[PDB]
Structures are given as structure tokens and as C-alpha cells.
């Protein structure tokens, strides 16, 4: 099994998983190939051949069950720990060796480390020590036992600390040692050791520019002392240096409020983060970190809120961040963070308009569309929250780059409680969510006098059920908003009017009687909405108006509410429109009330001089008194 290795490490065209079909031969293929590897890994080849080799070895390694065929691999891997380009592949290989016979892998590793220490003690140069600390950092999170034993030993500390002190400008050794310290901070005993014995050294190397970032990354893992780290990450990110390490750090650290206030305080860094997010060059992993930072820093508390709105307006809105984000390629996690950003920005109603102009509504809708049959998780909910807030404060038809705002409606309906015969919604929405959904729906229902939304409601019986199920909600604001929604939907008969005004249908006639009672709701906004339902339909659909004119409970209730509450202007107007439509359609209804003297003198009081923008009050009082006159003469 010789030539297979040559074609495996010969060029990137061939693949190992490819020629895995030519392998097989478990008695011979694995053994023979391992002998080829052993003779071949006896030297260091260029980065391409080595990358092929350590991409391929893990497979074979995972297979071969005879441990004495995988011995040499420990030396081969540890002796390449300084080779950066193939370091993670080595890790993978070691992990594969670790997956089966873990203990023997770690044992051979410890033995090789001890020989490396002896070689390092006899080296007039630092090259053996570099190798040793690179091997230690490479295998530390998998061989934690032997690595902790090495790091903690006086013999290893002696040579390490001494050569560090002596060779402060051996950048490869210092850097290897700082990466070692960071990685090794995983274990607790090592962390205590580092935090008891290295603070002097770390303060020292923190003063040296070319080691500042790596030293800060060690210090993170162990107030003023922290503040200096954060200022380092911020300044070095704003410069442009070590985008990867700094963004990772700050994405973690912006989980703390003080870090956030500092970041928002530093202008240059904010411009830099926005420009990096826009920059077509930064890696997708850095883009993700940048977005995590932006979402953390833009989040409203539940730091001073005004600082957060100032930051969001200055750097996210005015730098057209949302308009750009529409165009960058986003993973699902990055899209999640962008939804977070949009949500945060909309916590300040004054910005929603601008957000929508930059395309945020579109991003919300696409996000929901793609998650619809996929992941109704917390980001789904968050997206619906942002969308509801959007639709409460903007004109709907100019809100999704000329896409249909009505496409939001199915998503809004997911924050309405389903009829309680209808499963559990994956969405953990609250009463506030339901309230805001109904506000947004009420806004959608203004389009084309409610026909568009009503047609969406009629295509799915569930939607109308979830509305009707809020007619008697115990929360005043939900009941109020429901009635406002229904009254907007009653600007066009379509067929939704049958829900209340098809008297041949028992269910509808019952809903009618309920509505008549709702005319006397204590909440004046609810009352206005109920009145507008009746007034809209009666002034707009003459068939229904003829039927309503015969419904004595409605007429008596409307008159009672007019007698006792006519000093509210919207309510008075709507009751007058209802009553006059009814009376014009039915002289026998007029004859019914011709002797209600209190009704007559309330009507006369307004036939005089209504205030405000109110021609209808005198006009309609005049009409009604005229009909009563008709009946008395």
C-alpha cells in the first residue's frame, strides 16, 4: 500500500475519502499504509503534503484497533506542534487517537513531553523549549492529566520562567508561552498557579506592545485590572489589529454592562465595528462576532436608556447599517443577531420609520418565512415582536420595499391565543405580545377598508376564531384592541359581517347579542369601537341596516348610552350615525321612541351647538328630531 500515499499527498485534486475504496484490505491495507506513514512522517514535508496527511490520518486512526500500530503517531504529531498551518488537524488526529485507547495515547504523550523537557534543558537555544510549550498547548484540552503534571512541576517552571525572563525578544517563545498560559487556564489548579505566580510577568509583557493582546487574552481568564484588558481589546479593534481575537473577546465581554458602556463611549471603535460589518472582506466568523457585539450593545435594559438610544440612532441608523445588512451573506446565527439588532432598535418608536426605510421589515418577513416550517424558537418570537412594533408605528403600504405588508398577518396571528381546543403554540408570547399583535392587525385592517385583511381572515377559520375568542377577554386592553380590529374589518361587508349580522345563524345571533351588551363596556375606547362597528355597518350596508332597525335591544341600548354618555364626541357621533341610519330605515322604530322625553331633550341640546370638528352632531340630531316630529304630527 505504497502508491496510495503518494497519490494522497501528491496534490489537492485527489482525495483520501476518495481512495478509501482502494484501501479496504484490513489485514494489509491499514498495516501496510501505517508503515508507509511512519517512514513518511519521519520527515517534515511542505504544508500541502502535510495538510493532506493529517486530514487523512484521523480516518485510518479511528479504524485501526491494534494500538501498537498507532504508537509512532504520538511523536509524529507532537514534533509538529510548532507548525501553525496544520495545528488543528494535528488536534483532530490526536482526538481520533484519543477516541479509542485514550489512556495509552495520553501516556505516550506524557513520556514524549518529558523527553522534550530534557532536550529543552540541554538546549543553548530556545527552539526545544518553543517546541515543548507548543506541544503542551496543542494537547492540553485532551491530555489534561499529563499536561497539568508537566506545567505544575518545578523543573518545567524553572526553565520556562528563566528563559522568558532572559529572552523577552524571542517573539516565538513569548507568544507560544502566552498561548500555552491561556489554553492551560482550562484547569483550575493551573489557573490558580497562573493567578498566583505570573501576575508580575503578565504585567510586564502587558507593557510591551507586540505582546499586549496575547497577554490580555491570558488575563481575561483570571476591576481596574480588568478595565485595562477591555480598553486594550477596544483600542486594538478600533485600530484594525487582531480582528479575530478581539472580536471573540468583546463578543464575550459585552455580556457585562460596564463593558457595554465603555464600548458605547468609544466612538472610533463604533465606527470601526460598523465599517467591519459592512466590509466585504471580514471573515464570516468575525462578522458573527461583530453582530453579537452590536446586538449586545444596542439592547435596551429591562446603563442609561438614553445612551443606548443615542448609540442606536447615531451608529446603527445613521450609518445605514440595516440597509447594508440586507446585502451581506448571513448564516442563521448571524441572521439571529441581526433580528436582535432590529428588535433593539425598534424599542425606540421614533426610529421605526427610518428602520423600515432601510429595509428592516423585509428582513423580518424573510426571516419569518424561512423559519415558518423549521424553527419556531425564541428568535421566531423575537422577530414577531419587532414586526408587531414596526406595524404599530408606520404606514403599512410603504414598509417592505413595496412588498405586501399583509404578508405579516399570518405571523401576527401566531401571537393571538389559539382557541383553547387548538394545541400549544411553540411561541411563549405574553399578554403584551397579544396586545401589540392586535394593534398591528388593527393597523393592517385599515388597508382598503379592511378587505385585504378580511380576505386573509376568511381563508383560515382559525384566524377568525382567535379574534372572536378575545371578544370577552378579561384584560381591558386586549378586549379594546380586538374590538378596534373588528370595527376596522367592518368597513366593508365582504362576508365577515356574517359573523355578527346573519341572524338566521344561531352562533352569529348570539355574537350579535354579546356585541349589543358590549356597547355598555366601562372602557370608553372599547365603547367607541363597539359603537363604530354598529354605525359602520348600518351606514354602509342597507340590507343589514334594515335588519338592525328591528332589533329593539340594540336601539334601547344605543339610546341609553346616548342619554348617559353623550358628552364624549366620538361616541356621540357614532351613536347618532347608528340611530339615524336605523330611524331613516324604519318609521316604526321612530314611533317606538317618540315619547322618550329625556331622549328628545338630549337630542335638542346638541341640535344646538356641538364644539370641535363636529358638523354631524347637529345635523344628525336635527334629522332624528325631524323623524320624531313626523311621528307626532
465, three cell numbers: 376564531
10 Å CB burial of residue 20 (0-12, 13-18, 19+) is middle
36, three cell numbers: 508507509
Give the HSE-up count for residue 145: Cα atoms under 13 Å, Cβ half-sphere.
10
286, three cell numbers: 468575525
Torsion angles phi and psi, residue 221, rounded to 5: -85, 10
Give the HSE-up count for residue 274: Cα atoms under 13 Å, Cβ half-sphere.
24
Torsion angles phi and psi, residue 279, rounded to 5: -55, 125
398, three cell numbers: 410603504
Q: How far, in Å, are 150, 202, 229, 495 from residue 127 at the CA level?
A: 18, 22, 30, 85
d(CA 590, CA 625): 10
Specify whether the CB–CB gap between 562 and 583 falls below 8 A: no
d(CA 246, CA 259): 13
d(CA 97, CA 87): 15
Specify whether the CB–CB gap between 247 and 290 falls below 8 A: yes
**Of 139, 138, 126, 129, which Cα lies nearest the Cα of 170?**
126
CA 255 to chain CA centroid, Å, is: 15
Specify whether the CB–CB gap between 292 and 254 falls below 8 A: yes
Gap positions in the chain, given as the residue before each gap (C–N > 2.5 A)? 222, 302
CA 523 to chain CA centroid, Å, is: 36
How would you classify residue 489: left for phi > 0, otherwise alpha for psi between -120 and 50, otherwise beta? Answer: alpha
DSSP string over 156-182: HHHHHHHHHHHTTT-HHHHHHHHHHHH
Give the HSE-up count for residue 186: Cα atoms under 13 Å, Cβ half-sphere.
17
d(CA 132, CA 62): 26
Q: How far, in Å, are 356, 357, 395, 405, 565 from residue 402 at the CA level?
A: 11, 11, 12, 8, 44
568 SS3 class: coil
d(CA 267, CA 312): 12
421, three cell numbers: 381546543
**Of 330, 384, 307, 394, which Cα lies nearest the Cα of 356?**
394
520 membership: H or E segment, kind and range? none
Q: How far, in Å, are 15, 216, 504, 522 from residue 159 at the CA level?
A: 43, 23, 97, 84
Give the HSE-up count for residue 431: Cα atoms under 13 Å, Cβ half-sphere.
8
Cβ of 2: how many Cβ atoms within 10 Å? Answer: 11
d(CA 589, CA 579): 10
**Of 504, 525, 500, 502, which Cα lies nearest the Cα of 515?**
500
**Of 434, 494, 430, 507, which Cα lies nearest the Cα of 466?**
434
d(CA 237, CA 169): 24
Specify whether the CB–CB gap between 497 and 490 falls below 8 A: yes
519 SS3 class: coil
10 Å CB burial of residue 421 (0-12, 13-18, 19+) is exposed
Specify whether the CB–CB gap between 554 and 534 falls below 8 A: yes
Give the HSE-up count for residue 109: Cα atoms under 13 Å, Cβ half-sphere.
30
DSSP string over 569-587: HHHHHHHHHHHHHHHHH-H
10 Å CB burial of residue 36 (0-12, 13-18, 19+) is middle
d(CA 381, CA 389): 12
118, three cell numbers: 530534557
CA 2 to chain CA centroid, Å, is: 53
In sequence order, which residues have a C-beta less than 8 Å from that of residue 375 and are 6 or more positions away? Answer: none
Torsion angles phi and psi, residue 475, rounded to 5: -90, 125
145 membership: H or E segment, kind and range? helix 144-152
Give the HSE-up count for residue 191: Cα atoms under 13 Å, Cβ half-sphere.
9
Cβ of 286: how many Cβ atoms within 10 Å? Answer: 19
d(CA 540, CA 382): 40
CA 563 to chain CA centroid, Å, is: 52
154, three cell numbers: 518545578
List, in sequence order, the alpha helices (H) in 240-266: 243-253, 257-265
Specify whether the CB–CB gap between 359 and 322 falls below 8 A: yes
d(CA 196, CA 211): 20
Residue with cell 314611533: 591
| Method in brief | X-ray
Say which DSSP state 484 is in: H
Specify whether the CB–CB gap between 536 and 490 falls below 8 A: yes
Cβ of 197: how many Cβ atoms within 10 Å? Answer: 11
**Of 493, 500, 492, 494, which Cα lies nearest the Cα of 467?**
500
How many residues comprise the chain? 633
CA 522 to chain CA centroid, Å, is: 39
C-alpha angle with apex 62: 58 to 65, nearest 5 degrees?
135
The radius of gyration of the chain's CA atoms, rounded to the nearest angstrom, is 37
64, three cell numbers: 485501526
239, three cell numbers: 485600530
Specify whether the CB–CB gap between 453 and 447 falls below 8 A: yes
557 SS3 class: helix
What are all long-range contacts of 551-558, with beta carbons under 8 Å and residues at least 24 apart?
A: 551/512, 551/516, 552/592, 553/513, 553/516, 554/516, 554/519, 554/582, 555/579, 555/582, 555/589, 555/592, 555/593, 557/516, 557/517, 557/519, 557/520, 558/519, 558/531, 558/534
Q: Which sign does the torsion angle of CA 444, 445, 450, 452 carry?
A: positive
Specify whether the CB–CB gap between 314 and 323 falls below 8 A: no
Specify whether the CB–CB gap between 392 and 443 falls below 8 A: yes
Q: What is the 3-state secondary structure (H, E, C) of 420-478?
A: CCCCCCCCCCCHHHHHHHHHHHHHHCCHHHHHHHHHHHHCCHHHHHHHHCCCCCCCHHH
Resolution to one decimal, Å: 2.4
In sequence order, which residues have a C-beta less than 8 Å from that of residue 100 and are 6 or more positions away? Answer: 62, 65
Q: What is the 3-state secondary structure (H, E, C) of 584-625?
A: HHCHHHHHHHCCCHHHHHHHHHHCCCCCCCCCHHHHHHHHHH
d(CA 169, CA 164): 9
10 Å CB burial of residue 302 (0-12, 13-18, 19+) is exposed
d(CA 530, CA 537): 11
List, in sequence order, the alpha helices (H) in 372-419: 378-393, 409-413
In sequence order, which residues have a C-beta less than 8 Å from that of residue 98 and are 6 or more positions away? Answer: 105, 106, 142, 143
d(CA 287, CA 300): 22
DSSP string over 28-40: THHHHHHHHHHHH
d(CA 270, CA 294): 9
10 Å CB burial of residue 591 (0-12, 13-18, 19+) is middle
d(CA 71, CA 69): 6
**Of 80, 9, 74, which Cα lies nearest the Cα of 43?**
80
Give the HSE-up count for residue 275: Cα atoms under 13 Å, Cβ half-sphere.
11
In sequence order, which residues have a C-beta less than 8 Å from that of residue 474 and are 6 or more positions away? Answer: none
Q: Which sign does the torsion angle of CA 330, 334, 339, 343 carry?
A: negative
Cβ of 466: how many Cβ atoms within 10 Å? Answer: 22
Q: Which sign does the torsion angle of CA 355, 359, 365, 371 carry?
A: negative
Q: What is the 3-state secondary structure (H, E, C) of 215-242?
A: HHHHHHCCCHHHHHHHHHHHHHHHHCCC
Give the HSE-up count for residue 279: Cα atoms under 13 Å, Cβ half-sphere.
17
261, three cell numbers: 458602556
d(CA 583, CA 588): 8
Amino acid at each position: 500500500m505504497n502508491k496510495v500515499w503518494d497519490r494522497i499527498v501528491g496534490s489537492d485534486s485527489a482525495d483520501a475519502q476518495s481512495v478509501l475504496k482502494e484501501r479496504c484490505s484490513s489485514p494489509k491495507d491499514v498495516t501496510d499504509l501505517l508503515h508507509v506513514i511512519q517512514n513518511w512522517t519521519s520527515e517534515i514535508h511542505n504544508n500541502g503534503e502535510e495538510t493532506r496527511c493529517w486530514k487523512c490520518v484521523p480516518m485510518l486512526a479511528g479504524y485501526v484497533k491494534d494500538w501498537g500500530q498507532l504508537e509512532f503517531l504520538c511523536r509524529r504529531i507532537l514534533l509538529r506542534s510548532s507548525i501553525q498551518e496544520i495545528r488543528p488537524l494535528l488536534l483532530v488526529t490526536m482526538k481520533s487517537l484519543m477516541s479509542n485507547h485514550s489512556d495509552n495515547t495520553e501516556q505516550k504523550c506524557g513520556n514524549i513531553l518529558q523527553q522534550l523537557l530534557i532536550e529543552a534543558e540541554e538546549d543553548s537555544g530556545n527552539v526545544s523549549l518553543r517546541l515543548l510549550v507548543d506541544a503542551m498547548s496543542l494537547v492540553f484540552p485532551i491530555c489534561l492529566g499529563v499536561c497539568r503534571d508537566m506545567f505544575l512541576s518545578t523543573d518545567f517552571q524553572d526553565i520556562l520562567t528563566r528563559n522568558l525572563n532572559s529572552s523577552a525578544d524571542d517573539e516565538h517563545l513569548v507568544n507560544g508561552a502566552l498561548r500555552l498560559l491561556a489554553v492551560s487556564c482550562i484547569d483550575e489548579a493551573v489557573r490558580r498557579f497562573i493567578a498566583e505566580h505570573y501576575l508580575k510577568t503578565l504585567q510586564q509583557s502587558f507593557k510591551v506592545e507586540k505582546y499586549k493582546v496575547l497577554t490580555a487574552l491570558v488575563l481575561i481568564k483570571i476591576k481596574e485590572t480588568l478595565n485595562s484588558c477591555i480598553n486594550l481589546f477596544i483600542d486594538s479593534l478600533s485600530n484594525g489589529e487582531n480582528i479575530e481575537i478581539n472580536t471573540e473577546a468583546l463578543a464575550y465581554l459585552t455580556l457585562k454592562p460596564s463593558v457595554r458602556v465603555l464600548l458605547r463611549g468609544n466612538g472610533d471603535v463604533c465606527l470601526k465595528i460598523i465599517e467591519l460589518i459592512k466590509s466585504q472582506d471580514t471573515t464570516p466568523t468575525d462578522l458573527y462576532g461583530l453582530l453579537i457585539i452590536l446586538a449586545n450593545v444596542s439592547e435596551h435594559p429591562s446603563e442609561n436608556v438614553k445612551d443606548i438610544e443615542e448609540f442606536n440612532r447615531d451608529y446603527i441608523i445613521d450609518l445605514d447599517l440595516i440597509g447594508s445588512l440586507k446585502s451581506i451573506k448571513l448564516s442563521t446565527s448571524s441572521y439571529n443577531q441581526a433580528i436582535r439588532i432590529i428588535y433593539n432598535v425598534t424599542r425606540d418608536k421614533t426610529q421605526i420609520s427610518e428602520c423600515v426605510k432601510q429595509g428592516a421589515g423585509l428582513m423580518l418577513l424573510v426571516f419569518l418565512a424561512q423559519k415558518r416550517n423549521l424553527s419556531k424558537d425564541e428568535w421566531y418570537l423575537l422577530s414577531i415582536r419587532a414586526l408587531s412594533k414596526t406595524l404599530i408605528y408606520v404606514n403599512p403600504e410603504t414598509a417592505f420595499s413595496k412588498y405586501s405588508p399583509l404578508s405579516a398577518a399570518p405571523f401576527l396571528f401566531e401571537n393571538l391565543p389559539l382557541p383553547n381546543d387548538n394545541a400549544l403554540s411553540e411561541l411563549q408570547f405574553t399578554q403584551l405580545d397579544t396586545y401589540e399583535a392586535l394593534l398591528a392587525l388593527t393597523n393592517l385592517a385599515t388597508i382598503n377598508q379592511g378587505v385585504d385583511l378580511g380576505k386573509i381572515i376568511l381563508s383560515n377559520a382559525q384566524y377568525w376564531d382567535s379574534i372572536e375568542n378575545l371578544l370577552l377577554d378579561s384584560s381591558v386592553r386586549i378586549q379594546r384592541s380586538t374590538l378596534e380590529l373588528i370595527s376596522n374589518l367592518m368597513s366593508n361587508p365582504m362576508a365577515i359581517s356574517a359573523k355578527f349580522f346573519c341572524f338566521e345563524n344561531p352562533k352569529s345571533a348570539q355574537n350579535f347579542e354579546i356585541l349589543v351588551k358590549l356597547l355598555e363596556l366601562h372602557d370608553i375606547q372599547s365603547q367607541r369601537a363597539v359603537a363604530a362597528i354598529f354605525a359602520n355597518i348600518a351606514s354602509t350596508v342597507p340590507f343589514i341596516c334594515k335588519e338592525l332597525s328591528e332589533k329593539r335591544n340594540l336601539i334601547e341600548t344605543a339610546i341609553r348610552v346616548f342619554k348617559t354618555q353623550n358628552t364624549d364626541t366620538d361616541l356621540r357621533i357614532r351613536l347618532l350615525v347608528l340611530l339615524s341610519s336605523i330611524f331613516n330605515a324604519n318609521a316604526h322604530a321612530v314611533a317606538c321612541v317618540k315619547n322618550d322625553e329625556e331622549f328628545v331633550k338630549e337630542l335638542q341640546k346638541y341640535r344646538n351647538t356641538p364644539s370641535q370638528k363636529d358638523p354631524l352632531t347637529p345635523e344628525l340630531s336635527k334629522e332624528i328630531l325631524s323623524l320624531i316630529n313626523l311621528e307626532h304630527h
